[PDB]
Short mmCIF file of C-alpha atoms (C1' of nucleotides) and ligand atoms in Angstrom, two decimals:
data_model
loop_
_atom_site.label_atom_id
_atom_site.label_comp_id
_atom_site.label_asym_id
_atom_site.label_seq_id
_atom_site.Cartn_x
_atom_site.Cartn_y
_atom_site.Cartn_z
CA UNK A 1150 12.35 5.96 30.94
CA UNK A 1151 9.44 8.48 31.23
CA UNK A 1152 11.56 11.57 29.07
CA UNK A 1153 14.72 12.18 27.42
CA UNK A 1154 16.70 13.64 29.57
CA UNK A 1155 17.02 17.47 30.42
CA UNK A 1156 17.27 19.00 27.02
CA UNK A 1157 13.42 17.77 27.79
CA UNK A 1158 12.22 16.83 24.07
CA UNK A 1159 10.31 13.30 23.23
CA UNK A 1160 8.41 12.47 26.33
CA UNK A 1161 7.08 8.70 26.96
CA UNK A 1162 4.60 7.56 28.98
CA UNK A 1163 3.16 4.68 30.30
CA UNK A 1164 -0.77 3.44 30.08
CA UNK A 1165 -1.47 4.05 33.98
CA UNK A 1166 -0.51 7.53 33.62
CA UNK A 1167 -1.68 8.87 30.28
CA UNK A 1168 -5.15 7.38 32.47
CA UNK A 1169 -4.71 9.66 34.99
CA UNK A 1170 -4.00 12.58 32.97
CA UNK A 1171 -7.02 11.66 30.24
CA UNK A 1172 -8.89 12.02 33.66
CA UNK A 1173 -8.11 15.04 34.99
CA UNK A 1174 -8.21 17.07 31.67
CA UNK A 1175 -12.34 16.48 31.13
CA UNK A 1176 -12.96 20.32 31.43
CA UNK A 1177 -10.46 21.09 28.44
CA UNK A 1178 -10.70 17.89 25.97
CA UNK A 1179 -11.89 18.02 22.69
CA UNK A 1180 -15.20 15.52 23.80
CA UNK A 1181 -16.45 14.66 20.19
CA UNK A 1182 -15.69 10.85 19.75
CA UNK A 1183 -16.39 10.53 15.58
CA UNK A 1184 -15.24 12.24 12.31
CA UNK A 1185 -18.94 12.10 10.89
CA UNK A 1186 -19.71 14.56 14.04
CA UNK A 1187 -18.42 17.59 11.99
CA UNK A 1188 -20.21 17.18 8.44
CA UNK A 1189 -20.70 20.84 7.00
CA UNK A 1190 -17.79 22.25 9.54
CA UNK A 1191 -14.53 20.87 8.24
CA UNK A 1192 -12.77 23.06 6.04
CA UNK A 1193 -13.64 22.33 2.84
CA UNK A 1194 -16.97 23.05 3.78
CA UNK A 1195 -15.48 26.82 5.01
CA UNK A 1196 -13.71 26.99 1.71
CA UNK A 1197 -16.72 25.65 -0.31
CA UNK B 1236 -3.78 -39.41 3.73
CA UNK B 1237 -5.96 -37.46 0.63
CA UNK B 1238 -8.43 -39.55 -1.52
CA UNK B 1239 -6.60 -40.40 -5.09
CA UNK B 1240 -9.08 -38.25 -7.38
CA UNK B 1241 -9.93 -40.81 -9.99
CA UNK B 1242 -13.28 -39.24 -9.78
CA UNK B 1243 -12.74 -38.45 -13.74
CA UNK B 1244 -12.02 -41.90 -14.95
CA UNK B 1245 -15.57 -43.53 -13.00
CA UNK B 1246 -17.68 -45.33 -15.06
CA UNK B 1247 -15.13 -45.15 -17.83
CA UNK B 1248 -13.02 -48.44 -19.22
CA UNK B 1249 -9.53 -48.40 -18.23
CA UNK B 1250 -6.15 -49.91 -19.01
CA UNK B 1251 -4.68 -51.09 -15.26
CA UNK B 1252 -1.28 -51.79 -16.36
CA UNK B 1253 -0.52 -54.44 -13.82
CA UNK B 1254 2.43 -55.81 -11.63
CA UNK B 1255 4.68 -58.29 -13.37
CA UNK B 1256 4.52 -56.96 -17.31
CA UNK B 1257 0.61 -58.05 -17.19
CA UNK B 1258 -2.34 -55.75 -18.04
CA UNK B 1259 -6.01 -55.68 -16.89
CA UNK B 1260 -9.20 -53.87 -18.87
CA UNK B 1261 -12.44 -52.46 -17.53
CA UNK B 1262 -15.15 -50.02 -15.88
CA UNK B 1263 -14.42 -48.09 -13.08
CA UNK B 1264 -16.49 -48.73 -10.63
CA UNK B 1265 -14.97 -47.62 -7.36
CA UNK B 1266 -11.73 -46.89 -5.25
CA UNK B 1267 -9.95 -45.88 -2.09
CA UNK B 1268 -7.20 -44.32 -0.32
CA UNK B 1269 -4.98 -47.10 -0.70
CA UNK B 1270 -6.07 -46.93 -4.70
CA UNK B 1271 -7.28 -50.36 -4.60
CA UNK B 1272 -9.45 -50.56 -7.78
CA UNK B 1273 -13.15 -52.07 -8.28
CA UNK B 1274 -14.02 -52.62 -11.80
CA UNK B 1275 -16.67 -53.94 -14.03
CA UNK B 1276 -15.38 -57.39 -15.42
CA UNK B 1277 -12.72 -57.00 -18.71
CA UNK B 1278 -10.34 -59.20 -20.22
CA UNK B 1279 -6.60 -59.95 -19.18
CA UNK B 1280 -4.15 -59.07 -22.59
CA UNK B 1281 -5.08 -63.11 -27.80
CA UNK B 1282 -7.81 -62.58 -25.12
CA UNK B 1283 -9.85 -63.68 -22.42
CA UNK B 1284 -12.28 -61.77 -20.25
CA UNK B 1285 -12.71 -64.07 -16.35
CA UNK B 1286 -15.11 -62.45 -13.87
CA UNK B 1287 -18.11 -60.02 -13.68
CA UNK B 1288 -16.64 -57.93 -12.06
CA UNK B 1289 -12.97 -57.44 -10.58
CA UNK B 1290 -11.16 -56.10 -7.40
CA UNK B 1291 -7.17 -55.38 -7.64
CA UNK B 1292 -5.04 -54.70 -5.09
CA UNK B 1293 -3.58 -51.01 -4.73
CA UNK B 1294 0.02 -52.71 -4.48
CA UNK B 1295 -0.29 -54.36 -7.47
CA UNK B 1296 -1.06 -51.38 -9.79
CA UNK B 1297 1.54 -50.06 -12.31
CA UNK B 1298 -0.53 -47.70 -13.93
CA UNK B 1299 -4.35 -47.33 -15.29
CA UNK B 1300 -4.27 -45.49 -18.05
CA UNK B 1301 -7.50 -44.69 -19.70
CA UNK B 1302 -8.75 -45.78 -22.89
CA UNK B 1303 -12.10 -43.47 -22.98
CA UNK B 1304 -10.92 -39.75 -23.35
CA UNK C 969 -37.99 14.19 -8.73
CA UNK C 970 -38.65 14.42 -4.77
CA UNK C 971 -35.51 13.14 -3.35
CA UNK C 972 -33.19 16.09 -4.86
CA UNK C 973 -32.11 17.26 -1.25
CA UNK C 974 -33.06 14.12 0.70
CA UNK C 975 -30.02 12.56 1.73
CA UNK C 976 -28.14 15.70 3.56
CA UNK C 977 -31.35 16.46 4.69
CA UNK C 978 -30.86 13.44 6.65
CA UNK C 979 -27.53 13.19 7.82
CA UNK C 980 -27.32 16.96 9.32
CA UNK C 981 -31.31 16.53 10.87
CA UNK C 982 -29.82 13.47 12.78
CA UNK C 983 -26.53 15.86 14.03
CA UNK C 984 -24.53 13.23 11.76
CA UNK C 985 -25.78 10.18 12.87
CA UNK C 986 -27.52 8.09 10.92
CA UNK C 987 -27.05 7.55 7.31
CA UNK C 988 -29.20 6.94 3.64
CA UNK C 989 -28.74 5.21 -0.02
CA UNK C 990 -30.93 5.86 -2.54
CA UNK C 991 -31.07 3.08 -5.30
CA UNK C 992 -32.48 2.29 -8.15
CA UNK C 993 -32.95 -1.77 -9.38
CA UNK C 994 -36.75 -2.84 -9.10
CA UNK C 995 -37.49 -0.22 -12.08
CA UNK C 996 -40.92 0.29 -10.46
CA UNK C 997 -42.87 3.34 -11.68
CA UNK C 998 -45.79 4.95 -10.46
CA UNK C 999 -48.48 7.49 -11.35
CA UNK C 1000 -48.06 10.90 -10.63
CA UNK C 1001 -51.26 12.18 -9.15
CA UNK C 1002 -52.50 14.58 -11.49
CA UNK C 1003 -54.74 14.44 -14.85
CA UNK C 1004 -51.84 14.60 -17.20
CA UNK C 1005 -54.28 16.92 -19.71
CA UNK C 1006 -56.64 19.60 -17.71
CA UNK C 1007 -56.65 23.13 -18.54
CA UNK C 1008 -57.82 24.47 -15.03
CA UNK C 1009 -54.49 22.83 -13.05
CA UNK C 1010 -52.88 25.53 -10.58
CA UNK C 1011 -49.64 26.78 -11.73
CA UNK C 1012 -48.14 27.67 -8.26
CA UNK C 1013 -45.63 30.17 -9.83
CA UNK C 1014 -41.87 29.65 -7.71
CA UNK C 1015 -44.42 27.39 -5.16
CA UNK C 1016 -43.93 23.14 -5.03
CA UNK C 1017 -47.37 22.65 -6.88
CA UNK C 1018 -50.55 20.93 -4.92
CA UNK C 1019 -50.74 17.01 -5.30
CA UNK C 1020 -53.96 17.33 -7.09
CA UNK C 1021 -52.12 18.46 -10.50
CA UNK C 1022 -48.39 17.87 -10.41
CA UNK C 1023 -48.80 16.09 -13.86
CA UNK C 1024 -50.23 18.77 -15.73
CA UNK C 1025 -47.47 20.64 -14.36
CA UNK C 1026 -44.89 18.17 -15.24
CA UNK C 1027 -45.95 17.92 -18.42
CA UNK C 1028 -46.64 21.65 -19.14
CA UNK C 1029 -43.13 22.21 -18.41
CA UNK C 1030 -40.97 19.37 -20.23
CA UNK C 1031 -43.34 20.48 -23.54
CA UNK C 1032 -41.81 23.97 -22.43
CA UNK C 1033 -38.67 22.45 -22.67
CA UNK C 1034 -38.34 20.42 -25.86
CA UNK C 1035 -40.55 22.84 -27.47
CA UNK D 1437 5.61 -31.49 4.76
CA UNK D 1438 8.05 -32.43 2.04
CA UNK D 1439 9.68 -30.02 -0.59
CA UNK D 1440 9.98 -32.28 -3.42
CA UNK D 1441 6.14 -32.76 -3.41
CA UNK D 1442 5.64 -29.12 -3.06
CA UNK D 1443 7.77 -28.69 -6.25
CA UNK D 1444 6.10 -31.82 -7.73
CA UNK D 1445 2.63 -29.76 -6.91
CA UNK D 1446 3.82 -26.50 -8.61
CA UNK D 1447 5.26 -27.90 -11.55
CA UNK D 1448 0.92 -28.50 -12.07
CA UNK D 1449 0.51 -27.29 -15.76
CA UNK D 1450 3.84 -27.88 -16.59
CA UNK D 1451 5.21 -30.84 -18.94
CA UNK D 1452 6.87 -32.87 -16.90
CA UNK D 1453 9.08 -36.03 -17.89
CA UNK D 1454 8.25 -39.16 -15.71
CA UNK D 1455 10.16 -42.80 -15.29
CA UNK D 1456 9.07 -45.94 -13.36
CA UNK D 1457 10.70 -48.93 -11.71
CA UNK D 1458 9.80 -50.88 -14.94
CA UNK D 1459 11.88 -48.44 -16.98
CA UNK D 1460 9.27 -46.61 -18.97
CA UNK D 1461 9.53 -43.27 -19.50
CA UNK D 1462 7.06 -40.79 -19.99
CA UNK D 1463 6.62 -37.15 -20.83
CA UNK D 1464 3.28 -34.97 -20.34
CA UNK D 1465 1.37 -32.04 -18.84
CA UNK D 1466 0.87 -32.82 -15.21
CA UNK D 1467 -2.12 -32.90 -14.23
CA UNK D 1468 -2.20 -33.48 -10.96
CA UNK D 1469 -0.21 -34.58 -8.17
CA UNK D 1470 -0.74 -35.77 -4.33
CA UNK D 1471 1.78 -36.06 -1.42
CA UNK D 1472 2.40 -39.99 -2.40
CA UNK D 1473 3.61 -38.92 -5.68
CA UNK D 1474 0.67 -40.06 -7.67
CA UNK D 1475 0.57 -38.22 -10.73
CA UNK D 1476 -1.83 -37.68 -13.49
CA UNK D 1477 -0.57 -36.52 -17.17
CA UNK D 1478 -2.02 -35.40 -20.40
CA UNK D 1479 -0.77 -35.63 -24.21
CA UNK D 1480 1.37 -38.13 -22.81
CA UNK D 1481 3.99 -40.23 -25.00
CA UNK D 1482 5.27 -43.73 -23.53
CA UNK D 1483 8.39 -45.03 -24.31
CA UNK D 1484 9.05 -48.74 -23.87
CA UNK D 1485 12.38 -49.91 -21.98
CA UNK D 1486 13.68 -51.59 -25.17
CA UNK D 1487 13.10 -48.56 -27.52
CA UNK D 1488 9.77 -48.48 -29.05
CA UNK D 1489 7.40 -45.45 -28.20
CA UNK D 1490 3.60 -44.75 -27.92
CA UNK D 1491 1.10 -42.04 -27.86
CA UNK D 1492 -1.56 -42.23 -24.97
CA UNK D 1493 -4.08 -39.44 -24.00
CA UNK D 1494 -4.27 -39.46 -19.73
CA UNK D 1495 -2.18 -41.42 -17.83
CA UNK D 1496 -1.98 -42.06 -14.26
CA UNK D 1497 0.54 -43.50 -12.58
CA UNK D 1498 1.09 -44.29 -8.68
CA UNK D 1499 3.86 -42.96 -6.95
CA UNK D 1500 5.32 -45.94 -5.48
CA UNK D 1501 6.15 -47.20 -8.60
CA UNK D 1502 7.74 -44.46 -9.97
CA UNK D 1503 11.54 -43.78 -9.82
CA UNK D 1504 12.09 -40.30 -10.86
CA UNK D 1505 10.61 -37.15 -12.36
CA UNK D 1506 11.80 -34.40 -14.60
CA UNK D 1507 10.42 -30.72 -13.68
CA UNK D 1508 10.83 -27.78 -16.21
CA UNK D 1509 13.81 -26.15 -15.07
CA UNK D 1510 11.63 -22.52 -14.78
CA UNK D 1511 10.76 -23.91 -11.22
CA UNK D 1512 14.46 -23.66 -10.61
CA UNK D 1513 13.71 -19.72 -10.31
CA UNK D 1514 10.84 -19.18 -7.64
CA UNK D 1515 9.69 -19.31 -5.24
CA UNK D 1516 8.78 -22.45 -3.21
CA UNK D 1517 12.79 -22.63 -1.90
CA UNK D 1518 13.05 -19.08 -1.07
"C1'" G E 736 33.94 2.98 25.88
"C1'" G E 737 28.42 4.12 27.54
"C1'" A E 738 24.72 7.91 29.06
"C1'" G E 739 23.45 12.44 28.36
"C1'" G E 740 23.69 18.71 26.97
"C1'" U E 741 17.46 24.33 26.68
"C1'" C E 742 26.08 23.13 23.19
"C1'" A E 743 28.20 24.53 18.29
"C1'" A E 744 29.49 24.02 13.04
"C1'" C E 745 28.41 21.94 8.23
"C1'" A E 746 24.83 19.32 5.17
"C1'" U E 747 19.29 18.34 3.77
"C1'" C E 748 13.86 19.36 4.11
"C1'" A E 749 7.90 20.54 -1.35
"C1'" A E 750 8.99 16.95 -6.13
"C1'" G E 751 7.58 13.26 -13.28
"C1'" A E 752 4.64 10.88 -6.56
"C1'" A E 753 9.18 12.88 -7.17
"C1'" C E 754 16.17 9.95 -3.99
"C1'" U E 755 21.23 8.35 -4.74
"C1'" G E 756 25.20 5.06 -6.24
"C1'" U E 757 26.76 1.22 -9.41
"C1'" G E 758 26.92 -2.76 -13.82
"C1'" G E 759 25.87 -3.27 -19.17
"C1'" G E 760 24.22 -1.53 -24.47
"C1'" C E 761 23.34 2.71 -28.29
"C1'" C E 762 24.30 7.93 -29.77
"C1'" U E 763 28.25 11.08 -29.30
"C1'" U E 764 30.03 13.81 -21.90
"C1'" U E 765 24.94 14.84 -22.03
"C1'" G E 766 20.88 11.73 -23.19
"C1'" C E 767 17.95 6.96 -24.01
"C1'" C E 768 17.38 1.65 -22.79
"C1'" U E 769 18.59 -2.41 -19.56
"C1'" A E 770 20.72 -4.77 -14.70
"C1'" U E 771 21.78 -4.17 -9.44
"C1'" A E 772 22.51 -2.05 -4.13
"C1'" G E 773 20.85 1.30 -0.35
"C1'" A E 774 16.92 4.85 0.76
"C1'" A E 775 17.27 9.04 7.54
"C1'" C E 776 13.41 13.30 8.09
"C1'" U E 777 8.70 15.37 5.72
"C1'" U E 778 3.84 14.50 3.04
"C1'" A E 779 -3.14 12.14 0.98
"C1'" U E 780 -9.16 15.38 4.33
"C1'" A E 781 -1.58 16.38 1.38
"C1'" A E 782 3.24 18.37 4.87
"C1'" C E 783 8.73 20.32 7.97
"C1'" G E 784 4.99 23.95 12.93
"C1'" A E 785 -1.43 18.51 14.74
"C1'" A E 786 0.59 25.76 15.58
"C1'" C E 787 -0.13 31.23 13.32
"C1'" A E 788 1.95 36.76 12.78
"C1'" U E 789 3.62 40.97 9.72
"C1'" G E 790 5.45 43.52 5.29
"C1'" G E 791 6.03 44.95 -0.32
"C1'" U E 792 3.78 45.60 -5.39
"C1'" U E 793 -0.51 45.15 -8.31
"C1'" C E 794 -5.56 45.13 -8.91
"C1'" U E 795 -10.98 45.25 -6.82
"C1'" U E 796 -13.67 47.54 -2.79
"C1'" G E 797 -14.83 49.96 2.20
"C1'" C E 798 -14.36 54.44 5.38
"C1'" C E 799 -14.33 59.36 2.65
"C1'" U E 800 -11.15 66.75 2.33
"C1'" U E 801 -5.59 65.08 1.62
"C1'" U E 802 -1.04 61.57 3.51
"C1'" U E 803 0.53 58.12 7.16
"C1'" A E 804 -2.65 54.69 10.04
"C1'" C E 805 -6.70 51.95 7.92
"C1'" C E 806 -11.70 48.51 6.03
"C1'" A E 807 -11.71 42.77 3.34
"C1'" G E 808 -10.88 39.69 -1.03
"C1'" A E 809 -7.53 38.19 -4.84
"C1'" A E 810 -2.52 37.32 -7.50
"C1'" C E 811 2.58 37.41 -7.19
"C1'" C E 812 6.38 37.52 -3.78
"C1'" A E 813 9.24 38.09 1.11
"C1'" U E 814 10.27 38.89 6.38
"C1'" C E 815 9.60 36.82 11.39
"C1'" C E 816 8.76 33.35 16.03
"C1'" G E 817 9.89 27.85 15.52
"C1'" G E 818 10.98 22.32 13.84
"C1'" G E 819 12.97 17.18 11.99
"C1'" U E 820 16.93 13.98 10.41
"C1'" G E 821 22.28 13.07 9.22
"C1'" U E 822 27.71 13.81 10.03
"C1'" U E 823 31.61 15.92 12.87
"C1'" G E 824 33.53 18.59 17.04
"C1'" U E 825 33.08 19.98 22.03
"C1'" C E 826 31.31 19.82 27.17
"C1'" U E 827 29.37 17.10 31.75
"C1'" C E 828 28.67 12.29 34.72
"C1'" C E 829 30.35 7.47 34.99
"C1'" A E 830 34.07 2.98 33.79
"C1'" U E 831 39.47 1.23 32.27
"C1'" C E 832 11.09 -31.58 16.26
"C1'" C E 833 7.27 -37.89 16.86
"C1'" A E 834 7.95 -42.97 18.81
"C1'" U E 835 8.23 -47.56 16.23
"C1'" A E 836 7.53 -52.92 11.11
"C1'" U E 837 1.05 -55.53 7.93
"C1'" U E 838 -0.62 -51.90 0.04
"C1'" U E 839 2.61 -45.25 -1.90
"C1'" U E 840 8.79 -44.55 0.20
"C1'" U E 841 13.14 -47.01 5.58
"C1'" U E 842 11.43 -54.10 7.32
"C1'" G E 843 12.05 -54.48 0.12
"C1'" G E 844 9.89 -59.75 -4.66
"C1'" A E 845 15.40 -60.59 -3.42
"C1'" A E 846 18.61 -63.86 -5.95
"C1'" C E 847 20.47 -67.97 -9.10
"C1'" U E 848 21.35 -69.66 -14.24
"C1'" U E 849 21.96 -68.72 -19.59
"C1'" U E 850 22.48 -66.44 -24.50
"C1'" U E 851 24.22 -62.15 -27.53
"C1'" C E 852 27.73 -58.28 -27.83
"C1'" A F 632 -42.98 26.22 12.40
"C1'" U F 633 -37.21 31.59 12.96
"C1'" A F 634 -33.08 30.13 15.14
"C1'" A F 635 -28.87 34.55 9.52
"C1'" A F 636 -26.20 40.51 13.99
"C1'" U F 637 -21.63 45.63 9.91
"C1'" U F 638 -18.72 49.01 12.78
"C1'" U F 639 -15.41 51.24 17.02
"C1'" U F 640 -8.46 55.46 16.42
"C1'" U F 641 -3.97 58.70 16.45
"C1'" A F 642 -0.62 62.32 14.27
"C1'" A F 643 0.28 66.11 10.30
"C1'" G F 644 -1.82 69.66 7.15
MG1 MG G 2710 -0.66 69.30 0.61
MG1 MG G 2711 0.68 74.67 5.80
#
RNA sequence: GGAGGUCAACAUCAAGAACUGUGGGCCUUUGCCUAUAGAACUUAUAACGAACAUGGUUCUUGCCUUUUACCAGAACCAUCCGGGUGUUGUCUCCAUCCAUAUUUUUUGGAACUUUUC
RNA sequence: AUAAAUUUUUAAG
């Protein structure tokens, strides 16, 4: 269930998990919740 | 079940073609879901009007075509 | 005249929350502060001119512009 | 619910043709329609069992007395069946 | 016959918002119009890669004795590390729809007799 | 009532 096999492409996961993992990855994730967060720093705003 | 909307022919005189090749006139003046009819009194088709005003039966109703537009 | 900037002004002083509309339906007007003819009225020269003339100013100018 | 009301319903607008257990057939624009089949037509022509015909402007008529209707056969197409 | 493989080959992946086949009509195959069937993968804050390098030519600069090596922008092109889907082959592990009768439907107002043709 | 930050080296002659 959880991968395809051992040529190991298109994992699947579970909600319990993907939990666990969302957890433990605080110090690394992205942390901004919204789009309207970045306003003059997309990229058309670089380009522009 | 619905309520037969004869809400365009009130207070208008109407033709109520009747059971047994016989024919009523008159004034709508109310109905129901069964589409028993109460009228203002009219004549029976030379002529003769009876009543004030009428009840018929929904049963008994062929048609009631209208004679105002 | 005054709300030229207003609106991002807004939305980046909140850090993108927060939000404005500026409309226009009632058609309400309103003076403008100054004495619309005064010779003495302070042209502030690249500076927003002081309350006490900005119609002189106004006026002074758009004559500048149609001719 | 039943299908030949629903088609009775749609054919709204249309000119439908219209007999009754007396044997009087009629042809109009139906107005409206319930689930007892009680129509309402405009522009409507009558004809008489023995032959004769008449004009009439808005007839009604109550579905228990009536023995069979003629639909426009553009209904045939869509899409109240399937 | 099923599950797979850090296996292979051959197709296809940037466009009129776009694919292919087929039926019918006109011109004379193309092409236009009309009818019909199926459309995997990739695309709208646009793209196969939720990532990110280098090279060539041509201009503009920047360092500034000269050439490689360079400074940072543009245009036109390529190389390189990777990827999806489809078909086939091969290899490994296993198996031979209401429930009920009193005005709109189904508890009927049906029948008998007579004339014309 | 300001929060604005360029570089940087080797060979040959
Ligand atoms: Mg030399
Ligand atoms: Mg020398």
């Amino acid at each position: 269930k959880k991968v395809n096999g051992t040529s190991y492409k298109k994992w699947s996961f579970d909600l319990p998990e993907m939990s666990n993992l969302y957890r433990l990855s605080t110090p690394l994730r992205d942390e901004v919740t919204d789009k309207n967060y970045y306003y003059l720093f997309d990229k058309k705003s670089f380009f522009n | 079940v619905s309520t037969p909307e004869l809400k365009k022919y009130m207070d208008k005189k109407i033709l109520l073609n009747i059971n047994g090749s016989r024919k009523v006139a008159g004034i709508l003046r109310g109905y129901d879901i069964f589409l028993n009819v109460v009228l203002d009194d009219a004549m029976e088709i030379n002529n003769h009007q009876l009543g004030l005003q009428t009840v018929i039966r929904g049963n008994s109703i062929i048609s009631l075509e209208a004679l105002d537009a | 005249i005054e709300s030229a900037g207003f609106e991002t002004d807004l939305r980046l002083s909140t850090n993108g929350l927060g939000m404005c509309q500026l409309y226009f339906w009632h058609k309400i007007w309103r003076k403008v502060p100054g004495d619309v003819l005064d010779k003495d009225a302070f042209i502030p020269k690249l500076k927003p001119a002081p309350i006490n003339s900005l119609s002189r100013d106004f006026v002074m100018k758009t004559r500048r512009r149609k001719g | 619910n039943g299908i030949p009301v629903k088609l009775l319903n749609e054919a709204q607008g249309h000119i439908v043709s219209l007999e009754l257990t007396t044997g009087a057939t009629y042809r109009g624009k139906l107005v409206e329609s319930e689930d007892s089949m009680n129509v309402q037509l405009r522009d409507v022509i009558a004809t008489e069992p023995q032959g004769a015909v008449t004009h009439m402007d808005q007839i009604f008529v109550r579905g228990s007395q009536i023995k069979f209707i003629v639909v426009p056969d553009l209904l045939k197409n869509a899409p109240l069946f399937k």
